[PDB]
Enzyme design. Structure first.
Site, mmCIF file in Angstrom:
data_model
loop_
_atom_site.group_PDB
_atom_site.id
_atom_site.type_symbol
_atom_site.label_atom_id
_atom_site.label_comp_id
_atom_site.label_asym_id
_atom_site.label_seq_id
_atom_site.Cartn_x
_atom_site.Cartn_y
_atom_site.Cartn_z
ATOM 1 N N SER B 61 0.748 -1.258 0.000
ATOM 2 C CA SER B 61 0.000 0.000 0.000
ATOM 3 C C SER B 61 0.775 1.304 0.000
ATOM 4 O O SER B 61 0.156 2.369 -0.118
ATOM 5 C CB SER B 61 -0.985 -0.018 1.147
ATOM 6 O OG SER B 61 -2.035 -0.877 0.699
ATOM 7 N N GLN B 117 -11.106 -5.067 -0.162
ATOM 8 C CA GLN B 117 -10.544 -5.733 -1.318
ATOM 9 C C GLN B 117 -11.585 -5.888 -2.410
ATOM 10 O O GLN B 117 -12.780 -5.953 -2.137
ATOM 11 C CB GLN B 117 -10.012 -7.121 -0.934
ATOM 12 C CG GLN B 117 -8.652 -7.097 -0.211
ATOM 13 C CD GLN B 117 -8.311 -8.417 0.469
ATOM 14 O OE1 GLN B 117 -8.960 -8.831 1.439
ATOM 15 N NE2 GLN B 117 -7.284 -9.085 -0.037
ATOM 16 N N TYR B 147 -10.794 2.361 4.968
ATOM 17 C CA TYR B 147 -9.632 2.113 4.135
ATOM 18 C C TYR B 147 -9.948 1.036 3.115
ATOM 19 O O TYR B 147 -10.478 -0.019 3.465
ATOM 20 C CB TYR B 147 -8.462 1.718 5.019
ATOM 21 C CG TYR B 147 -7.193 1.479 4.287
ATOM 22 C CD1 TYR B 147 -6.752 0.186 4.058
ATOM 23 C CD2 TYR B 147 -6.382 2.547 3.887
ATOM 24 C CE1 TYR B 147 -5.524 -0.055 3.472
ATOM 25 C CE2 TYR B 147 -5.144 2.322 3.278
ATOM 26 C CZ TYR B 147 -4.727 1.001 3.087
ATOM 27 O OH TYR B 147 -3.520 0.707 2.570
ATOM 28 N N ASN B 149 -8.857 -0.723 -0.969
ATOM 29 C CA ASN B 149 -8.164 -0.796 -2.244
ATOM 30 C C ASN B 149 -9.143 -0.512 -3.370
ATOM 31 O O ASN B 149 -8.778 0.074 -4.387
ATOM 32 C CB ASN B 149 -7.597 -2.188 -2.484
ATOM 33 C CG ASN B 149 -6.401 -2.489 -1.645
ATOM 34 O OD1 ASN B 149 -5.655 -1.590 -1.258
ATOM 35 N ND2 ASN B 149 -6.179 -3.792 -1.377
ATOM 36 N N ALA B 315 1.678 -3.423 2.832
ATOM 37 C CA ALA B 315 1.986 -4.843 2.963
ATOM 38 C C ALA B 315 1.393 -5.644 1.836
ATOM 39 O O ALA B 315 0.408 -5.237 1.217
ATOM 40 C CB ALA B 315 1.447 -5.396 4.277
ATOM 41 N N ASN B 340 5.684 -9.694 5.987
ATOM 42 C CA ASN B 340 4.611 -8.810 6.450
ATOM 43 C C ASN B 340 4.509 -8.942 7.995
ATOM 44 O O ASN B 340 3.730 -9.765 8.513
ATOM 45 C CB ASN B 340 3.274 -9.218 5.805
ATOM 46 C CG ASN B 340 2.075 -8.450 6.361
ATOM 47 O OD1 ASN B 340 0.919 -8.862 6.180
ATOM 48 N ND2 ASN B 340 2.335 -7.337 7.027
HETATM 49 B B1 105 Z 1 -2.201 -2.103 1.620
HETATM 50 O O1 105 Z 1 -0.893 -2.765 1.800
HETATM 51 O O2 105 Z 1 -2.707 -1.648 2.910
HETATM 52 C C1 105 Z 1 -3.253 -3.092 0.930
HETATM 53 N N1 105 Z 1 -2.793 -4.509 1.009
HETATM 54 C C2 105 Z 1 -3.305 -5.475 0.209
HETATM 55 O O3 105 Z 1 -4.212 -5.263 -0.617
HETATM 56 C C3 105 Z 1 -2.794 -6.819 0.393
HETATM 57 C C4 105 Z 1 -2.284 -7.772 -0.357
HETATM 58 C C5 105 Z 1 -2.097 -7.573 -1.844
HETATM 59 O O4 105 Z 1 -1.933 -8.906 0.227
HETATM 60 N N2 105 Z 1 -2.246 -8.689 1.590
HETATM 61 C C6 105 Z 1 -2.729 -7.467 1.672
HETATM 62 C C7 105 Z 1 -3.050 -7.012 3.077
HETATM 63 C C8 105 Z 1 -4.387 -6.523 3.418
HETATM 64 CL CL1 105 Z 1 -5.793 -6.627 2.257
HETATM 65 C C9 105 Z 1 -4.608 -5.925 4.685
HETATM 66 C C10 105 Z 1 -3.542 -5.827 5.624
HETATM 67 C C11 105 Z 1 -2.246 -6.329 5.296
HETATM 68 C C12 105 Z 1 -2.005 -6.927 4.027
#
Ligand code: 105
Ligand code: 105
Lengths: 358, 358
Positions: B61, B117, B147, B149, B315, B340
């Site tokens: 992110s 997501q 929050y 995506n 992450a 992570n």
């Molecule tokens: B950002 O890093 O906050 C969004 N993260 C993601 O979409 C992601 C992925 C591609 O793989 N794991 C995550 C994740 C999420 Cl959805 C929430 C918290 C940590 C990692």
């Protein structure tokens, strides 16, 4: 100057002076960034003093553009925020109608109906607190625009409070000095009185009288050279070295509200370029410019648009000024006269000149 | 490098790596505007490939900060306005629930509950329109921050529509290149595969998988060198030559909404400095960071505040990144790891380091 500019300026202004019986006039055209000056007539009819590039004219409400930029500079400095309530800087304003009225509302004439003029009876500071405490809004904040000295004037006064500086000292130190506007004044010094033109109203020589919030709303006097530098600074703010001032200029040209096809900035008013001439010409008539009109909030404000006709008319009892510029074309014009003649005539002349130059 | 920087980074980061069992990690501290780098462990455990200054890590992110800045640059170019309806750039999005949802809402997670997501099954352009046309809000627009995506990812895709460039093309030519981020990619080319670290999740080496709006929401890969340059650029945008990029960086740090002591920018999140560490440390825990919170609009948005703690966690399944900086102090930090690990441990480490240096 290039014959094209000389011809377009003389063919437009000569008839204007004749039709409007203007005693004296100075005009600057900024073309491809360079200034070209023109002058006609008298700064002082009685003493036969001609208008020159050093003649001081009362800018009237074009002063609001300086107030808007100084306010923008204070925001950039982190001293104030347009989202702050008016009461944060004037705790004595305890009346309930002030809840919800922010510095943005004051700066953009959208507080709810603050009057065009501060009453002549308001002189003392106590008189001013009482006037605002007693004022009753006709509309909720941020719903209607009513052009008003008592609105942006109060913004100017509050915007400089954190600095601890007087409004004049703040304007001199943060705006005039950095931009090298060395012949621009809120109070004309004795040394420069010889260059201060007289304004004319019904044939009589007059100068603006002291009034509450005069410095903040309509009290700047300047020469055609300094006003050309002011236009150049607003056309290309990134060339300004002082960081917060550069930012303040940009903030004053952001679009906060829309009414019809006009957008309200801080002091400046803007329209999309190309503009429809009848639009800005008829719209400058006080029948429209001074009327109460509903406004649509621009949420969030649009940052300064290069393809804009940015402008401001100004008047005092004896003077009429107009400034307009188009950032995208590095083109602009300043028209200073010592007679308050109709706004439409000013805008029509400016449009003819700028349109002919591209 | 100063013995001061070496000491606090070593004392803070090495215990972190041990405590969290981080395979590889790279850190950059920007002190007085200059970068100082540190690397530890493996980018590829099996091959015993050391983490170096050329190692590419998944930013997760933290990519949202590039999306925010790219959107800011498009606003500066006059291609989009945050005040515009989402439907202006996606005419096909006709469902009634989108009335009133603007690009600002999308960029700042305030559209009304767009999901964290995008469902894994959504892959095609038809799938994507269907997904958004069918989404039903949890709240009205501009009332709650959740929050997501699916929110900023859509802002990114739409922000570049006017330019006609693909999202990757726009990001590369308008952000990566002017800033000389020569080892930053949305799609890692063959020549850089040897530097692309493996992420580790439950012992397994993993790379992020393709997903709808991945590039826009979490798909940038970069080295600790380019990331230090990214922090320097956001610390001091006035040094950037490209006018619209300089403005875009500034717009991304403007304060649009407030929740508690945090302000939402475009991608970046900010708090006033000095900051309360408990607040940013505990606030970064996903229990809180991913929960809905009521927002108060900042009307109009506060321009970028120099005395701010500006940051973003990031992450993917196998990586954990963090970036934080304080403009007023010319101080910043980037921490990239191929595991992570808990956000609070990242913020705690960053706070210890930056607080020690200023
Ligand atoms: B950002 O890093 O906050 C969004 N993260 C993601 O979409 C992601 C992925 C591609 O793989 N794991 C995550 C994740 C999420 Cl959805 C929430 C918290 C940590 C990692
Ligand atoms: B500005 O020039 O629009 C505001 N003008 C004034 O406040 C002013 C003064 C001091 O004297 N006459 C005016 C004036 C007004 Cl109030 C309205 C229209 C033209 C001039």
């Amino acid at each position: 100057a290039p014959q094209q500019i000389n011809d377009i300026v003389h063919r437009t202004i000569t008839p204007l002076i004749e039709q409007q019986k203007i005693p004296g006039m100075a005009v600057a055209v900024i073309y491809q960034g360079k200034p070209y000056y023109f002058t006609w007539g008298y700064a002082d009819i009685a003493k036969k003093q001609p208008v020159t590039q050093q003649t001081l004219f009362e800018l009237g409400s074009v002063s609001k553009t300086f107030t808007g930029v100084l306010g923008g500079d204070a925001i950039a400095r982190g001293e104030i925020k347009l989202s702050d309530p008016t009461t944060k800087y004037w705790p004595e304003l305890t009346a309930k109608q002030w809840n919800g009225i922010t510095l943005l509302h004051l700066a953009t004439y959208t507080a709810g109906g603050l009057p065009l003029q501060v009453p002549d009876e308001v002189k003392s500071s106590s008189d001013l607190l009482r006037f605002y405490q007693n004022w009753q809004p006709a509309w909720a904040p941020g719903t209607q625009r009513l052009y008003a000295n008592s609105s942006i004037g109060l913004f100017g006064a509050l915007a400089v409070k954190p600095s601890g500086l007087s409004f004049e000292q703040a304007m001199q130190t943060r705006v005039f000095q950095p931009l090298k506007l060395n012949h621009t004044w809120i109070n004309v010094p004795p040394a420069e009185e010889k260059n201060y033109a007289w304004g004319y109203r019904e044939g009589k020589a007059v100068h603006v009288s002291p009034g509450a919030l005069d410095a903040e709303a309509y009290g700047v006097k300047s020469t055609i050279e300094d006003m050309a530098r002011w236009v150049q600074s607003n056309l290309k703010p990134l060339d300004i070295n002082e960081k917060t001032l550069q930012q303040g200029i940009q903030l004053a040209q952001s679009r906060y509200w829309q009414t019809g096809d006009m957008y309200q900035g801080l002091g400046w008013e803007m329209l999309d370029w190309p503009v429809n001439p009848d639009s800005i010409i008829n719209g400058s008539d006080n029948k429209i410019a001074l009327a109460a009109r509903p406004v649509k909030a621009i949420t969030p404000p649009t940052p300064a648009v290069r393809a804009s006709w940015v402008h401001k008319t100004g008047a005092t009892g004896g003077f009429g000024s107009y400034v307009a510029f188009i950032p995208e074309k590095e083109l602009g014009i300043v028209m200073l006269a010592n007679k308050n003649y109709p706004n439409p005539a000013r805008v029509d002349a400016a449009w003819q000149i700028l349109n002919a130059l591209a």
